[PDB]
Paper text:
Members of the most radioresistant bacteria genus, Deinococcus, possess two [name]/[name] family proteins, [name] and [name]-like. In contrast, DrRecJ-like only harbors a [name] and a [name] domain and its biochemical features and biological functions have not been studied. DrRecJ-like exhibits a preferred catalytic activity towards short single-stranded RNA/DNA oligos and c-di-AMP.
Moreover, a crystal structure of DrRecJ-like, with [name]+ bound in an open conformation at a resolution of 1.97 Å, has been resolved. The refined DrRecJ-like structure comprises three protomers in the asymmetric unit, with two of the protomers forming a dimer and the remaining protomer forming a dimer with a symmetrical protomer from a neighboring molecule. The crystallization condition used in our study contained MgSO4, and we observed two [name]+ ions bound at the active site. The second ‘H’ of the [name] motif (H122) was not directly bound to the catalytic metal ions. Although our crystals were soaked with the putative product, AMP, before being frozen, there was no AMP density in the map. Like other structurally characterized NrnA homologs, each protomer of DrRecJ-like consists of a conserved [name] domain, in which five stranded β-sheets (21345, ↑↑↑↑↑) are sandwiched between a series of α-helices, and a conserved [name] domain, in which six stranded β-sheets (123465, ↓↑↑↓↑↓) are sandwiched between a series of α-helices. According to the structural data, dimerization of DrRecJ-like is mediated by hydrophobic interactions between several α-helices (the α7 and α8 on the [name] domain, and the α10 and α12 on the [name] domain) of protomers.
Author numbering:
A (entry chain B): 10 to 334
B (entry chain A): 8 to 334
Write the structure that this text describes.
Amino acid sequence: DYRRNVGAVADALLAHPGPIVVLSHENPDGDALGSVLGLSRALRTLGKTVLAPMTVPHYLSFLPQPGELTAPLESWPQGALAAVLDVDNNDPVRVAGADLTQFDGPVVNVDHHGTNLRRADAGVVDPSKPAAAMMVADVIDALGAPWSEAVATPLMLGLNTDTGNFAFDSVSAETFECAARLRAHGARIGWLNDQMRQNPQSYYLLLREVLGKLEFLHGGRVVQTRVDEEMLARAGATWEQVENYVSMLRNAEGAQLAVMAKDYGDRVKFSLRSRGPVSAQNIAVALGGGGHVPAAGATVISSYAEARARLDAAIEAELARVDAQ
Amino acid sequence: TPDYRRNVGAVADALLAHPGPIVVLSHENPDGDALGSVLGLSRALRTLGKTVLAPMTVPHYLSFLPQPGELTAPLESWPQGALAAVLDVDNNDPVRVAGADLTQFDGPVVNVDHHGTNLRRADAGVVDPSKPAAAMMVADVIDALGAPWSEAVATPLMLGLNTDTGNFAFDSVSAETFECAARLRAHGARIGWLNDQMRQNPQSYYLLLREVLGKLEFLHGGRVVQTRVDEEMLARAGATWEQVENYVSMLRNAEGAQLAVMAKDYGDRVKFSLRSRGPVSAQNIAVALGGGGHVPAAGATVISSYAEARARLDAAIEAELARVDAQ
Ligand SMILES: [Mg+2]
Ligand SMILES: [Mg+2]
Ligand SMILES: [Mg+2]
Ligand SMILES: [Mg+2]
C-alpha cells in the first residue's frame, strides 16, 4: 500500500494541468522546508507551475533562492492542486501559507505523523519513516526521477534535522539507504552542515543566561533551569529561541531529569526532559498537560516560587514511580 | 575496486591463516574510529576462536564502549609468534602506534588505514583515503573473514563511522558511507544508545561553559568574537585544561564573525587559537604576535600576562581589519 499510495500521489501530481500549491505546517522545521523545496524543485523541472507560500525561519534562510517561497496566499489560483507535506491536510489550522478551508480542488498529502486522518484525493502516511523528506524522495522517483543536486540537497537537510543527524532510534537501515541515494544524486552534505552550525549572537548571550539559572539539584540526579523576559532582553533574543536548550540539559550525567521553566511573569510554562528509569509524562499528567510519549509540557498560572514547588512535588511523585517499578 | 577488494581479501587471509596471537593496535589518544575499529575486529576475530590482545588506553568519554577487561594495558614485550594488526594508523609510523613497540617486533604486520600519508608497506595491507572511517574498511574485512555478524560487532564500528564523519556531516561522507551505516544498523548497531553515551556531559562541562561564556565578547560589530579561560575558572568549575578544546569551534560558528579567538591564560603565558573566514587572515594576526599557521587557522603563545597580551592582540586585529577594508 505504501508503494501504491506513493504512486497515486505522483500520478495525481503528474496528471494535474493547473498550478500546484505546495504547503507544510506552521513554524516549518528542516523537514517541512526541505520537503517543500525538494518537491517544488522537482515539479518545476517537470514544467509544473508551483506556488510555495512559507515563512522561512532565519536559521534556514540560506536554503531558498529568491522567489522560491512566497508570502501567504491572498487567494487560491483557479484550477489549483494542494500538495500538503509533513502535516495533515485535515488540520487546516496547522497548514500555513494558504487557507485550506476555502479551497475545493484536489488535495494530495505526504506525512509521517500517526495522528493523520488519512483522507485526501491521494495520500501516503507512514509513521515508520523518520522524515517526510524520505517519503517525498520516493514520490520524486515516482514522478519520473527529475533528480539534481538542487532537489537532493533540501531533502537531505530534512532527513538530517528530523533524525537529529542520524542520532535518534527512529533511524533505520532504510533511513541510511535514503541518505545514500540523496548523496549520489548530489546532496551537499558538507555545505548543509556548515550552514546549520551558524548561531546568532543571541544564541550565545541567551545560553550564558540559561546556564546562569542552572542547578544540579535532587542530590545530583535532577537539573533545573529558568528564563525570564529580562534575560531575553539582555541577550537580545526571543521566546522561540528558548526551545534550543532543554535538549542540551537532558545530556547531563548522573542525572535523570532536566527541567526547563519559561517564566513569562504571570505563569510558568514548563518543558521537562528526562532519561532512564524516569518518565516525564507521569508529571505532565500529575499536574496536567499534553505532548508525546516521553516529552512533557505543563502551564502553571502562579508566580515563580510556587510553580517550581508544585513541579518538585510531581518529580518526587515520579521518584516513587521509579522506587515501585 | 578490484585492488581494494583484493587487499581486503589479503588482510583477511593473513588473519585467518595466522595460528598464534594477534595483537590489534591503533594510534595513541585513540578516537572513536580507533577504539571502534579495534573493538569490532577483536570481537569478530574472537568468534572465530582467535587469541587476540588489544592494548589500548581508553579516554573517559569512550569508556562506555568496551566491555570490561576487553582491552589490556600496553605490552612490555611481544607474545611469541604474534601478528600485529594495525588499524587507523600507519604501521610504518611506530611513534603513533600505541600499546606495543613495533620497532621491537619483526613478525607479520597487517594494516587497515584511511589516511593518505600512509607509506603503504605491510605484509598485507589496504589503505583507502576515499573511505572516511577505518571502521568502514574493518567492516569489509569482517565480511571477508566470514565472521558472524551481531550487534556486538556492528555497534562499535557504527561509533567509529559516526565520530570520524562528525555524525555523517563532513564533506567526506559518500554514498557508500551511508550504505555502510545501513548495513551496520541492519546488523543491530545501537544507534540511539551510542548517541546517548556520546552526549553524557559532566557538571564540569556546563560550569566551564558558563565561565567561558561569562567572558565572551563580540567586538568590531560582530566581526570579531573572543573569549578566554584561566586557572581560576578551571578551579571554580572543577575542570581541566583538556576540556578547553571544543571552544574555538563553537566560536567560529558565530554569525557575522570573520575571526574567533580563544585564549588559554596559564599564569606566565597565554596561548591564542585563531580561526578566520572570508578575507581575514588569521595568520597575519598570529605572525604579529610571534606565532603563525595557515591563512584561516593559526596560533601563538605570548609569554606575558593576559592584559599585556590582549592589548597586543587587539592591535594586531585592528591592523588586519584595516588592511581588509582598504582592499
Ligand atoms: Mg516538521
Ligand atoms: Mg517531519
Ligand atoms: Mg583515527
Ligand atoms: Mg579514522
